[PDB]
Amino acid sequence: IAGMVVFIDPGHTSTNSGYPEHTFTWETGLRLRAALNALGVRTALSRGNDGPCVDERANMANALRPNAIVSLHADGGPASGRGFHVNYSAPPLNAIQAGPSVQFARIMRDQLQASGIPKANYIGQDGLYGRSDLAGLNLAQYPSILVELGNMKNPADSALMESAEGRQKYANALVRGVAGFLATQ
């Protein structure tokens, strides 16, 4: 999988303590980036600091023609909801969204779950959510999923997110998912 290309998009809500989504996603994205570089995988970021709106991120991603595009987010849901969901475009607007992107979503869900990140109990089904409303996924022409790693309003998710150890956990799970999909390609 060395020499493959992966585009990482740190999204942009907040935790009750006021730890912002954009910083969580930025930091976790950096850890994922380091892990991938360690695997010989070529990476890029949607932004260079802690930005672009959804179109330039689509054009950047498409322009780089990556093997995989992974967007990182955290939800602001009702407090009792916790866990991750992996969003993918459905119904597909092209053949990549119809196949490779779905496989990527399934492999990512499996690996996040195997790494100790609980699947969302309040949204999607079994940690997956096929949807038609997200511009970022719809416009993608290369394999692309959007991961909501958890709910910032949930005490447990927020506890993981506001902790460096938790963020590294999330990164380890993400890297297992990405590497897992890349190997099938």
Ligand SMILES: [Zn+2]
């Ligand atoms: Zn977001």
